Amino acid sequence: KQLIEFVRWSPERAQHYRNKGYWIDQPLTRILTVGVQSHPHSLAIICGERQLSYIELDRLSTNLATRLAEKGLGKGDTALVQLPNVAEFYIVFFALLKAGVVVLNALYSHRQYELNAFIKQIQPKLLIGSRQHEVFSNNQFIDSLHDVNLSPEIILMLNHQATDFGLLDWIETPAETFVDFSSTPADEVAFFQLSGGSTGTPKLIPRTHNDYDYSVRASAEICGLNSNTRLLCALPAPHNFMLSSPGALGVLHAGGCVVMAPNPEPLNCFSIIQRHQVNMASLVPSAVIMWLEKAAQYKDQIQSLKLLQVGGASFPESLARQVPEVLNCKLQQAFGMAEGLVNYTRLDDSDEQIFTTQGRPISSDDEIKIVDEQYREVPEGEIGMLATRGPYTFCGYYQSPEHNSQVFDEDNYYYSGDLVQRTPDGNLRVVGRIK
Ligand SMILES: Cc1ccc(C(=O)O)c(O)c1
Numbered sequence: 001k002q003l004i005e006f007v008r009w010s011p012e013r014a015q016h017y018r019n020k021g022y023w024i025d026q027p028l029t030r031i032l033t034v035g036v037q038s039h040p041h042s043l044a045i046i047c048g049e050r051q052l053s054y055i056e057l058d059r060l061s062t063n064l065a066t067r068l069a070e071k072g073l074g075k076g077d078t079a080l081v082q083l084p085n086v087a088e089f090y091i092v093f094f095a096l097l098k099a100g101v102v103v104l105n106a107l108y109s110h111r112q113y114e115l116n117a118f119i120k121q122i123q124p125k126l127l128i129g130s131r132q133h134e135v136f137s138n139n140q141f142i143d144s145l146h147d148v149n150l151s152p153e154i155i156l157m158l159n160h161q162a163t164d165f166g167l168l169d170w171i172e173t174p175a176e177t178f179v180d181f182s183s184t185p186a187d188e189v190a191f192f193q194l195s196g197g198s199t200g201t202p203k204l205i206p207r208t209h210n211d212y213d214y215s216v217r218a219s220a221e222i223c224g225l226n227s228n229t230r231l232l233c234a235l236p237a238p239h240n241f242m243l244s245s246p247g248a249l250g251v252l253h254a255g256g257c258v259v260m261a262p263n264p265e266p267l268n269c270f271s272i273i274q275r276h277q278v279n280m281a282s283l284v285p286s287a288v289i290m291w292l293e294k295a296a297q298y299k300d301q302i303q304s305l306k307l308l309q310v311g312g313a314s315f316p317e318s319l320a321r322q323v324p325e326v327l328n329c330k331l332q333q334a335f336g337m338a339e340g341l342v343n344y345t346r347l348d349d350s351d352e353q354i355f356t357t358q359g360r361p362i363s364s365d366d367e368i369k370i371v372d373e374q375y376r377e378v379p380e381g382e383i384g385m386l387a388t389r390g391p392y393t394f395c396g397y398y399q400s401p402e403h404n405s406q407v408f409d410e411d412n413y414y415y416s417g418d419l420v421q422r423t424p425d426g427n428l429r430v431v432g433r434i435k
Pocket residue numbers: 196240241245246311312313334335336337338342343
């Protein structure tokens with residue numbers, strides 16, 4: 001009966017974020033509902049040979065939602081999803097948003113240790129994975145959950161076996177009966193993001209409809225997405241970078257099309273880029289380097305690329321300058337975190353800004369502090385610890401009041417651990433990490 005708990009923004013901040021237009025109090029499904037009304041037959045997802053229109057995506061995720069509702073899964077319930085980079089991932093995502101099930105998307109690279117940690121934390125009644133994944137190749141993991149009174153009520157499986165509930169079977173057919181369902185309320189939790197760089201298992205980050213949709217809508221505008229955008233999704237679909245900054249969600253928000261890749265391997269990616277005339281991609285520096293090593297041989301396959309986001313790790317100026325020279329597309333640098341704050345270089349920034357900085361916050365109401373060890377602000381220019389709060393930055397990890405007291409100060413700034421300096425033009429330079 002009780003919605004998943006989380007740490008709320010103050011009412012004065014919530015009102016402000018509504019007054020500014022950031023929070024519009026719509027569920028994340030808004031992206032899909034609006035696309036369906038404006039352009040139902042535009043492509044939403046390209047995945048191998050498949051083409052999913054906006055309305056196909058809408059129908060398929062509604063189907064799964066009705067089947068989960070039929071089974072008693074809804075508001076108050078949680079789900080663990082571990083899917084590879086395929087269209088089913090987004091059908092499942094929009095199905096759980098529609099049903100009011102708070103979902104944690106594990107990384108496809110996560111193994112038993114992490115999944116066990118996640119299951120113990122959110123006690124999901126729904127588990128969705130793939131039989132092709134190492135963990136579900138047999139039934140030992142699924143069986144172990146019973147031994148700890150932690151079995152889900154329902155397990156759905158991609159590449160299922162006969163005795164399994166087939167994920168595609170629950171997606172292709174709506175439920176026989178009708179049960180009502182609805183999203184969690186817009187200022188309540190929609191799903192769980194996962195921390196990056198945390199010591200042990202990644203910590204759970206509750207994200208509400210309001211704050212996630214805002215960061216999606218604002219990123220989309222800042223990266224110039226429109227209905228012609230075709231964005232390669234080669235990083236892990238669940239990752240904050242690939243899902244929302246601007247990510248698949250940002251492209252759906254703009255009415256465009258996401259184009260799937262299993263991973264960033266250059267030759268397969270180059271092929272997909274040529275086959276579907278991909279014009280945007282988002283990569284971490286290690287993958288950029290892999291593409292740089294092969295781009296000259298395949299200039300022709302990747303010509304249609306227009307814009308590359310790069311972030312997630314150190315990206316020195318000398319590498320950045322190769323992007324336009326070798327990959328033949330504009331560069332956009334980003335520095336974000338699944339906890340909230342996302343920075344982009346702007347499309348009209350100077351070349352020095354794009355090449356030597358990681359940009360500036362999405363929102364004019366992102367508040368930044370850069371502090372020393374005595375937590376006093378450093379003089380402009382100097383290196384400090386980054387602390388931040390804003391209309392899409394969380395207020396605390398799930399069920400972690402001890403840790404939360406350590407990484408938030410009295411004014412509820414979040415201390416991300418990143419070291420940064422603010423350049424004279426106003427942009428940020430990510431310079432290292434701190435314990
Ligand atoms: C835009 C962006 C870039 C990097 C990350 C990250 O977490 O590494 C992110 O969340 C968002």
